[PDB]
Design a protein around this ligand. Structure first.
Ligand SMILES: Nc1ncnc2c1ncn2[C@@H]1O[C@H](COP(=O)(O)OP(=O)(O)OP(=O)(O)OP(=O)(O)OP(=O)(O)OC[C@H]2O[C@@H](n3cnc4c(N)ncnc43)[C@H](O)[C@@H]2O)[C@@H](O)[C@H]1O
Ligand SMILES: [Zn+2]
Length: 217
């Protein structure tokens, strides 16, 4: 099962991805996470990605396509995979068709999680993450028991560098311009499936699971 989760920042891609991989046992490939990992490690790519990420801009296509190509070549992707946040430009989608064909694979579904921009703004600015264990909370939608403290480990909660209002405004704009044309691109190939992301988390997951059940039918 080869899947793509696509959506504007804050739509709930990572949230749903965790639930999906836990049910199927397939790898979760997130370009955002890979870039953050390179940043922490201090590699040449992490230093380059940092500048774009901090501004809410997209990292150049050539660079992004390369790290994905390398990741998809591993044996752990033999039973399927879930691409989260890639592709997000037409150039990236065209490259993906080719990269997959090269390893003898074709996409099953491109799940587009749709949410209105005003809601997305709130989704991101209110997000708080645990500095210790990485658990995610939301000040409005799902707050911790005690303010500023992680329920899981007692760690400090903080706001991601790119989740401030100004950076979020730029992220939404560039992703809207680059990613939205992908809806049409994938509708044409028949891979696209829309999911209403303005529902409670379990309901969004149920809609996805229902969609995925059809692959086994
Ligand atoms: N392909 C690519 N090409 C070029 N550059 C690339 C690239 N990929 C990455 N990059 C670069 O890397 C940067 C970062 O990329 P990335 O980290 O991938 O940024 P993103 O796409 O903006 O996604 P987000 O993590 O911010 O949101 P999400 O939808 O996963 O949200 P979550 O599930 O936490 O949910 C958000 C919040 O809402 C809450 N929530 C989730 N679902 C619900 C729900 N149903 N109801 C209420 N609250 C909910 C969550 O708890 C949370 O607080 C990019 O800006 C770019 O610089
Ligand atoms: Zn924690």
């Amino acid at each position: 099962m080869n899947l793509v989760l696509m959506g504007l920042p804050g739509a709930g891609k990572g949230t749903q991805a965790e639930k999906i991989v836990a049910a199927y046992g397939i790898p979760h490939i997130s370009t955002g996470d890979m870039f953050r990992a390179a940043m922490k490690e201090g590699t040449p790519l992490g230093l380059q990605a940092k500048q774009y990420m901090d501004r809410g801009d997209l990292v150049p296509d050539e660079v992004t396509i390369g790290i994905v190509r390398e990741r998809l070549s591993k044996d752990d992707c033999q039973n399927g995979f879930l691409l989260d946040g890639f592709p997000r430009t037409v150039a990236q989608a065209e490259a993906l068709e080719t990269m997959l064909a090269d390893i003898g694979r074709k996409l099953d579904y491109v799940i587009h999680i749709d949410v209105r921009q005003d809601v997305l703004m709130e989704r991101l600015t209110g997000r708080r993450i645990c500095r210790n264990c990485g658990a995610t909370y939301h000040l409005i939608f799902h707050p911790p028991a005690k303010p500023g403290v992680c329920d899981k480990c007692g760690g400090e909660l903080y706001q991601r560098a790119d989740d401030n209002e100004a950076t979020v405004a730029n992220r939404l704009e560039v992703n809207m311009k680059q990613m939205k044309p992908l809806v049409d691109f994938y509708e044409q190939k028949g891979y696209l499936r829309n999911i209403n992301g303005e529902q409670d988390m379990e309901k969004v997951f149920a809609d996805i699971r229902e969609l995925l059940g059809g692959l086994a039918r």
